[PDB]
Amino acid sequence: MMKVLIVESEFLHQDTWVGNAVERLADALSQQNVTVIKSTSFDDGYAILSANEAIDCLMFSYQMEQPDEHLSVRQLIGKLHERQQNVPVFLLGDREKATASLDRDLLELVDEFAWILEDTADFIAGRAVAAMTRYRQQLLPPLFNALMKGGVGFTKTPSGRFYHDYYGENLFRSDMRTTLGSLLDHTGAFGESEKNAARVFGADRSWSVVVGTSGSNRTIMQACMTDNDVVVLDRNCHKSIEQGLILTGAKPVYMVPSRNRYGIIGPIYPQEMQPETLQKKISASPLTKTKAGQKPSYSVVTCTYDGVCYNAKEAQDLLAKTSDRIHFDEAWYGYARFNPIYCDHYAMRGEPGDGPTVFATHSTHKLLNALSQASYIHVREGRGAVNFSRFNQAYMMHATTSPLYAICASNDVAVSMMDGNSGLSLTQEVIDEAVDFRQAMARLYKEFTDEGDWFFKPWNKDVVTDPQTGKTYDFADAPAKLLATDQNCWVMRPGETWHGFKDLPDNWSMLDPIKVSILAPGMGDDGELEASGVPAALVTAWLGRHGIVPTRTTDFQIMFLFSMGVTRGKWGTLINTLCSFKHHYDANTPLAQVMPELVQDYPDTYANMGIHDLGDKMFAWLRENNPGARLNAAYSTLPVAEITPRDAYNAIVNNNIEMVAIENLPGRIAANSVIPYPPGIPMLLSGENFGDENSPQVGYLRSLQSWDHHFPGFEHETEGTEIIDGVYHVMCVKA
Amino acid sequence: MMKVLIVESEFLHQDTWVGNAVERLADALSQQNVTVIKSTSFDDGYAILSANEAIDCLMFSYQMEQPDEHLSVRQLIGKLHERQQNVPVFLLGDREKATASLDRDLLELVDEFAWILEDTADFIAGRAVAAMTRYRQQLLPPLFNALMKGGVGFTKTPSGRFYHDYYGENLFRSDTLGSLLDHTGAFGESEKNAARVFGADRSWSVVVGTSGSNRTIMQACMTDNDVVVLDRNCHKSIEQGLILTGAKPVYMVPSRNRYGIIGPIYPQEMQPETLQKKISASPLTKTKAGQKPSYSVVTCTYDGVCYNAKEAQDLLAKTSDRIHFDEAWYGYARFNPIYCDHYAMRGEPGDGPTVFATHSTHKLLNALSQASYIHVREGRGAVNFSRFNQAYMMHATTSPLYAICASNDVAVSMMDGNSGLSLTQEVIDEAVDFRQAMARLYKEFTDEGDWFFKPWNKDVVTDPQTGKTYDFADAPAKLLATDQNCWVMRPGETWHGFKDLPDNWSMLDPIKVSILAPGMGDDGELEASGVPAALVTAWLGRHGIVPTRTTDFQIMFLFSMGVTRGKWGTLINTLCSFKHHYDANTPLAQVMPELVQDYPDTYANMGIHDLGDKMFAWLRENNPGARLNAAYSTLPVAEITPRDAYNAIVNNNIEMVAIENLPGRIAANSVIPYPPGIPMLLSGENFGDENSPQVGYLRSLQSWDHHFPGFEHETEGTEIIDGVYHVMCVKA
Amino acid sequence: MMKVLIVESEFLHQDTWVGNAVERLADALSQQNVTVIKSTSFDDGYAILSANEAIDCLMFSYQMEQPDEHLSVRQLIGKLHERQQNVPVFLLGDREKATASLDRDLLELVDEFAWILEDTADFIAGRAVAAMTRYRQQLLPPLFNALMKQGGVGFTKTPSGRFYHDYYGENLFRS
């Protein structure tokens, strides 16, 4: 049903006959089954649109004398088109004045003229209904629009009827080609949607995927390499990127990213991407030795989970020297293109036209807000390009013959949301909120700090600079519009303490504002632990009881993910919970009260204790066992790659497999990848060797286990590891 | 909100004070926010339950004197528990009579006693509400139940809000409970439960369809060093596994019949000695001869041919320790006794060879698209959890959509217990009514010297109880919908048309209703005149009916659990209206306007009959049915592995070769023409000689396309360039 | 059933569009089966809380310019927490001004921020319902809370017993 917002100007209430004429009109619209929303000020109308009140037509009266009004009109209409881009705007005006004002500027604002003191109400109403109808027909994107033109089996059982009524009949009514087209064939509206997605996301062609970025990654890899090829891999890679290695059987070489003192993974340095460096890696590795000097057929780089953004323009030019195919796993980073703060720090920059072949991979569900399993493969065709016929064989490989339309439709509307003005407005809203939160957290931190007290501080720049004025601000004191706009407020520059990446070159990295990492006290700037501190594991647990589960957690880092799904002002809850923690920490309130579920489980360990007592005991273990250094030891230098991930997986199929305990891991080959959290990237991949008797990888695992035993209920998650009889085991190859 | 059906017995209306007491009760329930459905006869109550009125409690009055009533009660309660299995049944009765009758039989029927002329209405109401609450807690299956205890981002744009409101907030709202990939918590409980229901040792819930399921199984069962035994009639996804694994295939060739319908792989083809011969003969496997194959796959056919899976398994067990049945179109089989012994997961699990069963839950169990199950019976050469989950994760997604997994969970619940039998029986019953109705019409027309469509099924059946013999049309419906032998393909029988098919091997699925247009003689040669199915399929298409399968004379209609009762009448009504226009030869301008507008030169001043004759004439002349058999009777020579062939695509050793230059060339991708709709060539196989039957069959398919525009054959693995058939090939 | 007190600041009546936005919010809450109590002055809101009107959430608008208001806010919220100690307090405010004021003192008063001229009414309503739910779950003391999760029936069988039963109420026996 159709919806009209009428805004009566404040400047014409003086003239009561205008309001009467508007009422006659409002009446005429209601008579044609149109919902009318009356509004009595530009301020009120602005606020209604500032909420998300979806209208199909805006009407407004307009005196056209006061300049305060002229502006208020520009603001209102400007506001409408931020997210309601093509809503028809009717001017309810004076014929003489409007006529005289008529110029290009006015016609960009106003779509249609209705002279309200001089025309039949029913005629204007009719014109509006007509304009609202064209708006509606033009609104929806190709695929979802097509789908607007049977769940019966479920209704025959009670449990099935409950399910049916819960999820709704339309979800099933979206099942089946025939006029609409097929996904796998990429025809009809499915084809139109992809052609459209490519336009919006700045690609030559796009491939709609319904098996997630996992499926997308595997698909790209399938098209770009065989077992005869060498490939250059970001060590910080998705599980699915290893999966491709196993299916393809290609020969890998890894680029090792930097870390910092808080345990946060930083970027791969340019030195590591140099042709000469990669060629040395290739000749050194057992897997690639025999294929030295061969041109690698594929290259992959990951935005980091913690929000580190590469200068993709420079990164691409470095990798282009070595490989003709460069794949950026932009799973957490689909929005990048649609806000200028990320300028140059994503794959699909500007308009396509032609360089190397560049792939970009988005998980639409993650941060673009869409149905789970929704993903896109975006392609810029260049050197070593794979055409449709060839690539579609790789696509079909990892697809399903009957995909769920509801997911594909969610991909189509997600495109529409980033297209045009909506994209900028949505991305800006989330940045704005993340900034407000960061700033609020920084101000609290100074308040406590200044008073000789502790608190959590946000991980971001210490000091920023306004370019237009030259003026310098502490983060807390900065203007919000600066931080939410100026990219240089987030670029990681050399000599800066905050980011903590030793010898990071200039104009390479950048912090993503919406990936708000927060730091508990305990880690000194020098890299060694402070006198006392608050371990994050304890905070994460407290947050957990209050229905808040952070994305990442290191020893001192807690990362909160701001997305487009976040409502305005909700970050206040994060602060409120963080403050209530501090209060209980300072008070050392008994665990019986603050964490009852834990004491009930392990009474022997956490008996007659308080929340501060545990914090101190955890922080004590941290000093003694020194895990941060052990982490770096295990990741600084890669384990020796003895066989290919494929060969290692094939050992599983042939049953050359053995569950090896932690203490007998040295000298053994891992059958599956091993990924400890932290840092949450692979320590070992399939086919790599755990190493010496005094190995750092096995070492880091030992400390992780030691933590688990000392602090029950706070056990580390580790993929590739099965805990048997209270002991860490890993599936290994049989010697 | 809660819902009660009260059935006032017909035998107690005589006693008006009973009805008053029931009214007092109905009132008490309404006062506790309970929807009451009053019913005044066992017949009416039976009919309400015979519909699908979901109730949470049944109450009924009961005189307990007349035996006509005693039965009517058994029928009513029996009906309730068909699909509403655990609904609490309240007896609104007389204390003295009920007491005296009380035995085991009564207590199976009645769950709870309420003496209505002797008890406070509010107390009974309370007891009911309590019983309904306990019923509700027990109702839902593990995962979906757990999910009953945020789409906001979409609301910020108008196009997004429209999408959000259309699909509903709960779909997004579904994004302690456990993880799928870890197989923990309620996800784990659901799978353990699914295994129980479907008769497996363990089950794996899949969210990438049977394509993903098939690829997963194959990943766990073979490497490039292995030999594998493949049903030639296989899913595209089974070839995909071959390419990913790099294993060395050998194919089992199924039979066809005169109508072009794919029949079963004969036992002779599954014999160890036959398979060992195939292995030694093939270029891909020659070097691995005498090696024990690590995997074996057999497909229920699309057209409804069901294997005797017990016998088939025992034959394949001799050769391989892993046997995989692709039961994608066939998940229901287990839950109706008419399919007895003709599916993988027979009886209870306990231990033989390791057997896989693959279901597409969305296809015929009725569920969200992409829903699939891998069912496993662990035996010899079994793959344990740790090992298999690595193969599972290989073809999974890190964030799966809960709505799909939940649909898998409730789909299990629907086949579990009584509901499964009742649902499967409903669809069989409907399919039978349709088949019989179609057979009777055919006799009516035939007898009067006229033509019509006949159903593809047995000509004559036999009642075992009586010995008596019936023509299909004349048979009792109860017999056809129950007795398996009415569907078993036996030797010497004309109807099924599979030359030399052994006894007790195959069986026609009742719900896979194939229908036959006239034109094909029993002898295998074409008749004087006929009606080609392509023309009928088109007419059906215009009336919003798109058949699953279509050969030259076969049109197949798929009866499912989603089908409403009696809807087959529409199929007949449309088929009759076609016949009318065919006999009348009404102009194509009227009956098929879209076609004449598109290709006026070809279909000018023509009628529907005229086209039929022209199509049937082409059929006699070009003789495509024989050309089909030529191309499929003998397999093409396998020059390289599908993996090697796919790798040519990656390395760009690729060339789009036109139909005429195909001889001697290797196919880069599989080539699947419809009909028959199974692979003629797979990746890495050679099109063959200068006078090759495969390239031949393609030429005739192309010839048809050119002669009859708008009726073009669909062929996967083929690109039509400049009006010519091309296929992607390897570069010599 | 849940209960919200909304206090429209006296210092923002001058701006009529604020009151409209509050009305849109009040409407959204009512639609989610929440009893709304509107109040048009800090004095009135203070007086309602000064009585013993049991609410599950306090919302208020706030100009944040006059110091007379800053105090009136402190008094109101201070009053709430005298006996309604953990009731969640929503600030219906301006993003820019609130942000700039944000310190430890404010966060002791205000539990949650809702920017009313810039956010969907239904979202705020939802957040309130959520906050009111956690408040309710946290409210009652251990024993009495547990007790909220033959039954006085025997009494109903005699008239004198039914009278007694209805007088003292079913829950007394139910315990």
TrEMBL record, chain A:
Residues 361-375 form the Orn/Lys/Arg decarboxylases family 1 pyridoxal-P attachment site domain. The gene is adi. The modification N6-(pyridoxal phosphate)lysine is found at residue 366. It comes from the Bacteria. Keywords: Decarboxylase, Lyase, Pyridoxal phosphate. GO terms for molecular function: arginine decarboxylase activity; pyridoxal phosphate binding. This is Arginine decarboxylase. Belongs to the Orn/Lys/Arg decarboxylase class-I family. GO terms for biological process: L-arginine catabolic process. It is an enzyme of class 4 (lyase).
Automatic annotation (TrEMBL), chain C:
Belongs to the Orn/Lys/Arg decarboxylase class-I family. This is Arginine decarboxylase. The lineage of its organism: Bacteria, Pseudomonadati, Pseudomonadota, Gammaproteobacteria, Enterobacterales. The gene is adi.
